[PDB]
Amino acid sequence: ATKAVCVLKGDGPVQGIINFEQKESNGPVKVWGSIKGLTEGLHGFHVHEFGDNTAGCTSAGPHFNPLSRKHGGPKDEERHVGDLGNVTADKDGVADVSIEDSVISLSGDHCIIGRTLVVHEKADDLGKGGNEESTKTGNAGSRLACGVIGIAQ
Amino acid sequence: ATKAVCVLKGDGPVQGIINFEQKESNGPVKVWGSIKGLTEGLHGFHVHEFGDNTAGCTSAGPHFNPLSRKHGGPKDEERHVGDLGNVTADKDGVADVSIEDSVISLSGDHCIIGRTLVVHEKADDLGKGGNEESTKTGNAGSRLACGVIGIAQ
């Protein structure tokens, strides 16, 4: 699968479309789109383990972390597969997204298709926030918006 | 035993949770759950090719038919991978689903995780409708409600 897409929606105004492209199965995944509805500033941006929205975003569960590592930022060696850092919303609540990542995949064991992309309430402190929660979830707060990542044309 | 789940939703009152379970890679896929908000009677229940909701259910595209077969019913040899037949709404609009299918899969070429389950407007005529369309789509009409099939716990 070389393309994927996620429609983010949640209980308040957070909504967005995030596209994923991996033209090479052992290359990086391009991640791109916009999210609006957002308080200006930095927002956690993570792959959670499950594509389960039966009870809203809480259902997705934890980060996708198949290898059982500590939470870190996308550029760290010590991180979850799902740790994609923070997106930044401008003064207008619009976050334009442009990421490449070489940990997540569109195939194989690091495959995120069928899982959940979640935009969070506050900044992921990237494991450098000074408390025990930081090295688990990065303290990014609640789940504003989520959507199961799906195969795209 | 890999597991999957779809939360089905649309512009209307139709809402559902459909669950998937395949205890063996080659095993049959057991699919159970509920859908409410339906007119009494049968509605077509189809897996469509994409997990794309950028435009509502339309963007899921056509039935998932990797083998270029003709539309038929779940019990037919000539059918799409996606052709799961019809679910039945009681007169209170509730359709308790309990299917078992051996053409869909949670693994492999015929993997449906990341694609889109859809419940349609009308009965699927199962390719036995007597017109050109019957054998393309099954005359099931509009997509009432769909969800991306996601990995579940």
From Swiss-Prot, chains A, B:
Disulfide bonds: C57-C146
One Pfam family of this chain: Sod_Cu
Gene Ontology cellular component terms for the protein in this record: axon cytoplasm; cytoplasm; cytoplasmic vesicle; cytosol; dendrite cytoplasm; dense core granule; extracellular exosome; extracellular region
Annotated effect of mutating A4V: In ALS1; severe form; reduces structural stability and enzyme activity; increases tendency to form fibrillar aggregates
Modified residues (N6-acetyllysine): K122, K136
Modified residues (N-acetylalanine): A1
Residues that hold Zn(2+) according to the record: H63, H71, H80, D83
Effect of G93A: In ALS1; increases tendency to form fibrillar aggregates; ubiquitinated by RNF19A; ubiquitinated by MARCHF5
Database matches in InterPro entries: SOD-like_Cu/Zn_dom_sf, SOD_Cu/Zn_/chaperone, SOD_Cu/Zn_BS, SOD_Cu_Zn_dom
Similarity-based family: Belongs to the Cu-Zn superoxide dismutase family.
Miscellaneous: The protein (both wild-type and ALS1 variants) has a tendency to form fibrillar aggregates in the absence of the intramolecular disulfide bond or of bound zinc ions. These aggregates may have cytotoxic effects. Zinc binding promotes dimerization and stabilizes the native form.
Descriptive protein name: Superoxide dismutase [Cu-Zn]
The species this protein was found in: Homo sapiens
Gene that specifies this protein: SOD1
